[PDB]
């Protein structure tokens, strides 16, 4: 990875951590290095923010208005803005609200007032695209944007459970089973991934590719309990060919 990303990478750690040593420092080296990247620019809006200081924040915003007008950083930063206070920040409120109560097509009607279909970053944009998501229409840009989270902000292990059973949902597996494996490598949601990952094996009919299939399960999960189980219908499963 390129050291902007890492530097970039780390502003959203010290974000997340509410750590705004992290997030000064590589703020710092940061408009060194790329003074006029829209990512930057946007990460110091956000902090300025942060700080309350609207003033810096709107001149930054102007700063990536005439930079980089229809970046989904400017938008991004705008929608935050719109939120910083009063107004916006019930409308928030109350999406959330029927979000909460169940009235999910009202909250994704408010959301989509709101967000404009560029969500503030952080988990709010997971929330919004994992909603948009449950639109059958939407659902592929949606997907799209998730997986774009996914790698900006790895180790979601809720992200990548709703991402993969998407990716399932639309007989995309090869990715899914991408995103499976990259729930697999972390410790949360190992036994999620292979709960997914055997949910798969038990809706293809007992045969060769299946036995192939649940092997390769097996070359991807070592221990659990469904793995145990996986070992237990492989044999029985292998043992079935030939009468």
């Given at each position: 990875?390129?050291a ?25 080296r ?25 003033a ?9 208005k ?42 994704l ?35 799209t ?15 990548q ?25 972390s ?48 044999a ?8």
């Amino acid at each position: 990875p390129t050291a902007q990303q890492q530097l970039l990478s780390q502003v959203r750690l010290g974000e997340a951590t509410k750590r705004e040593d992290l997030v000064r420092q590589s703020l710092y080296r940061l408009e060194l290095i790329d003074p006029d990247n829209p990512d930057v620019i946007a990460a110091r809006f956000r902090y300025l923010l942060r700080q309350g200081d609207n003033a810096g924040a709107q001149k930054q915003l102007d700063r990536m208005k005439q930079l980089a007008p229809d970046s989904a950083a400017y938008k991004s930063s705008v929608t935050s803005m719109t939120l910083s206070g009063a107004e916006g920040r019930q409308a928030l409120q109350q999406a959330r609200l029927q979000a909460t109560t169940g009235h999910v097509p009202e909250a994704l009607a408010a959301y989509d007032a709101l967000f404009k279909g560029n969500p503030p970053e952080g988990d709010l944009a997971v929330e919004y695209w994992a909603l948009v998501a449950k639109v059958p229409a939407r659902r592929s840009e949606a997907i799209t944007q998730l997986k774009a989270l996914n790698a900006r902000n790895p180790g979601n292990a809720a992200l990548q459970n709703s991402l993969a059973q998407l990716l399932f949902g639309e007989g995309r597996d090869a990715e899914a089973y991408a995103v499976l494996e990259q729930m697999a490598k972390s410790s949360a949601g190992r036994e999620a991934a292979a709960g997914l990952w055997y949910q798969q094996i038990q809706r293809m009919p007992v045969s060769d590719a299946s036995v192939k299939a649940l092997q390769r399960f097996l070359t991807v999960f070592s221990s659990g309990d469904t793995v145990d189980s996986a070992r237990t219908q492989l044999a029985a499963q292998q043992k079935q060919l030939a009468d």
